Subunit: 180 residues, 5 copies
């Protein structure tokens, strides 16, 4: 036979002693929600294919939750996982971490705005930023936090004046022209 | 022709000092009973699929058991594995191990109460605790074994006197709201 | 699409710096003898599937042994592997290692008689014990080897005196009852 | 039970603290562009298999880009990846890196000219070296940067004086005839 | 719905600092020549399955070789790999490297004679040693290069005087019996 390419199931544990093959919880929750919502197979199998992706403390929770209610849906199992493992960030601490992110790692301007944007996305899920200015606070924090050249600095400020508040892909296209 | 998303076998070994990817026995027995009862495959291949999850002392038991009776069923193999490796606990010993279990130096309180809830389920399956007092022995064992940061100590002492005591998911909802 | 469990080939090497993913030779020899004896495929292709389980020094032995004789059987290759890598136990080191093996460090008595039984199979295949008394030397070595009290000793001695010499499974059943 | 030969998905992550399994981005982009262009599967499942090769910061860029515009093509995702992680060399910096690259302590002459040729290809793709003299700057940089042992310096000076100019494989044939 | 066995593709890299999974080149070339000769698919598929076995410097050679001539066959690619990485040794150098090879400072005598026998096969393929004296040079080179002592020295010199000299497997049996 011709060779097989394959992807591992992403495994989650909740353990503080996390292995290199174990993901952070949000990555696993995307896989688990795909199994719950998008796979064609019955919920009596979807319970099992979620459990196969768990080991250690997080697998114990799958047992605890089914012991409390054998009739539970997979979606409601994931609500229990969200309840337990969903992050402890406050509005204050998400805002501080978003504002005190500052190109320290020698990043390109494009790489810095990628890292920053992960925290901005988080802050917008917490509603810690108004969605109607999420683009403005991106420009603000990039212009505060990045070692800009003037030719890009004035181009961002022109877009800020004109009203085309960049989406992340628009801000990237604008950064592409000056960074290349 | 395309990548197949495929899943890790749950390895077991029976050694005290097990490797980081090797499961506790109860989790392995759940996999092995699925191979025994549920898979469509012929029984000569069921033995193969059981044995290819074993390593070290547990694989040696499979060899011993097969050598004394080549005609043995996979069900009677798993009865031998239960009879060797299965948990030995009783009413008094399970209550003691539960009540003796305190918060370890590296544990966050939310992780400790999750670990502790597994021990409570163990004790309830041994009929060592009546389910109708499980909430009491949660709050009390948490308060006896963990440090509670003074502010959560007051909140759990309030809840202990409140009347309607927390279920585990609600207790975690509270404990996460103090982990922030 | 739907995931299923993959089973990794058990690679062997004979290297002194053995990797965690490399089995001890006896485990590999079971896999290789299965490929030799049980697989339906032609012997030229059996040589290939045996070779794909080897790397480093043990793969070089496959090349050396084929270079001496291209017509060689897989069985004769495995005789060369047994010669080179199989353990050098004598009828006096097997007996001493067996008889010197006590229960240790607070092992479960069941886990001890399992550990002990692996050495008794080693000694019986060396014919370093008469097969017709293997159960006798097992009972005696357990009674000498396991630190004990209570009726367990009395029950084993009763079975020894009565004449119903236990199989390993019957011995294990009795040991669990007094271990719990 | 017959084994299939398998090939692992080359994972990428974009962290500067990269793990030993993770490729440089240029190799990952060759896999990702195969998925985008060649595989017969619909774009939703193409996006899934591209994303399933990612871990950490690179996966965060995929999530950001899909959230910022769900209508985006796979090719447009890869354009975002090219911008963020693709190396921004210049005619100045590439010429410097090429000419600066001398033979390390451990490199044999063939291993050195192989490493060196990768940097020459890099520089030629930026038009930093005219293709019609690429071979000239190869032989010259070999002589400038190699610690050619005694008679190798004499032989390479005769080869710089050859007349017609070697392609890389012809230069390798010559170097390998000397190498002992 | 079927669980499956997996064999790892033998990755090669050509770095002198080779990682623990990575083969010596001659073993990789045996895999790549299987892909070139024996697999039924077109040359475009063959090129891909060869490239997906390569990592680091050796993958860069595959890019260089294809970029010079996209019309190249996989057979001609493997000739370029043989030329760059495949060993070139003369009769003088193969004789010297066999004779200069002593027991390594932490090595066992049994591992040494197996390591040494690989170098004898190498030297016989260069026609650097006549096959009809290979046994003589095995005993002499073991005795010259190993930290021998005790009745092993006596038994080996006895075997040198015996008339018909050991085969490799018989010499290993003797050295293993003294290893105990």
């Amino acid at each position: 036979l011709l060779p097989v390419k394959y992807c591992k199931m992403r495994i989650f544990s909740g353990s503080t002693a996390a292995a290199p093959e174990e993901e952070p919880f949000e990555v696993w929750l995307e896989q688990a929600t795909e199994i719950a919502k998008e796979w064609p197979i019955p919920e009596a199998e979807k319970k099992r294919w979620v459990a196969e992706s768990l080991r250690g403390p997080a697998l114990d929770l799958m047992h605890i939750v089914q012991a409390d209610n054998p009739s539970i849906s997979v979606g409601e199992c994931l609500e229990a996982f969200k309840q337990v493992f969903g992050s402890t960030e406050s509005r204050r601490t998400s805002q501080v971490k978003y504002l005190r992110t500052y190109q320290q790692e020698g990043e390109k301007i494009s790489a810095y705005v990628l890292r920053l944007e992960t925290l901005l996305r988080r802050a917008v899920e917490k509603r810690a930023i108004p969605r109607n200015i999420a683009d403005q606070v991106r420009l603000e924090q990039v212009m505060a936090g990045a070692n800009l050249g003037n030719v890009l600095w004035c181009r961002l400020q022109e877009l800020k004046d004109q009203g085309p508040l960049p989406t992340f892909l628009q801000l990237m296209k604008v950064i592409r022209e000056e960074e290349e």
